[PDB]
Structure 1
Amino acid sequence: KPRQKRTATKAYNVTQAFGRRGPEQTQGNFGDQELIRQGTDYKHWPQIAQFAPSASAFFGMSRIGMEVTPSGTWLTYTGAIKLDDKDPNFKDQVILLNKHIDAYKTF
């Protein structure tokens, strides 16, 4: 499957699907050891997935570019998604996201 359409699971985990976590610009930085090993089987995956954009929102919210780099042709994307501070789950969402952002620095 094209990288962007892959779904990580225990049998095909985040490292297998999307590479090792890291700081480089072509690397993903999200996930602690449990999420990396479990993918969408992770016990709190639906709480993470609620922030992932629909296809319409991905192209509607993001700043999209197209670049030729020494590795080939890339569609770039950047943006920001607001957390709903009136969601009763807000504080646990903050804790959950903090547990996974740049978690690889500690393993």
Structure 2
Amino acid sequence: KPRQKRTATKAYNVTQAFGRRGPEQTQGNFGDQELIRQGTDYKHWPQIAQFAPSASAFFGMSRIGMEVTPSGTWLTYTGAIKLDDKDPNFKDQVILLNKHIDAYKTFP
């Protein structure tokens, strides 16, 4: 399956589907050890997925580009998604994102 369409699960985890977490611009940086191991089976996956864009919003909100590099032709994307301050779960959302962003830095 094309990388962008893969779904990580316990049987095909985040590392298998998307590579090890790391600091390089080509690597993903998101997920603690539990999320990496379980993917969409993770107990808080719905609270993470609520921030992922629909296909329409991915192409609607993002700055899209095309780059040719030695490894191939790449569709680049960047953007920002605002959290809802008024959501009663806002503080829990902040804690959850903080637990996963750059979590790999403290892995043994």
Residues in 2 aligned to 1:81 and 1:34: alpha-carbon distance in whole angstroms: 24
SS class of match (1:36):
helix
Query: Hey, what does 1:13 align to over in structure 2?
Result: 13
- Give 1:8 deviation, angstroms: 0.2
CA offset digits 1:66-94 (Å, max 9, x no partner): 00012110000000000000000000000
CA offset digits 1:13-35 (Å, max 9, x no partner): 00000000011111000000000
User: Aligned residues, how many?
Assistant: 107
Q: Which runs of 5+ in 1 are unaligned?
A: none
CA offset digits 1:47-75 (Å, max 9, x no partner): 00000000000000000000001211000
1:87 equivalenced with 2:87 (yes/no):
yes
Query: Hey, what does 1:47 align to over in structure 2?
Result: 47
TM-score (norm 2): 0.98
Residues in 1 aligned to 2:23 and 2:4: alpha-carbon distance in whole angstroms: 19
- Give 1:6 deviation, angstroms: 0.2
TM-score (norm 1): 0.99
- Give 1:7 deviation, angstroms: 0.2
Q: Which runs of 5+ in 2 are unaligned?
A: none
Residues in 1 aligned to 2:13 and 2:28: alpha-carbon distance in whole angstroms: 14
CA RMSD in angstroms comes to: 0.3
Residues in 2 aligned to 1:80 and 1:102: alpha-carbon distance in whole angstroms: 17
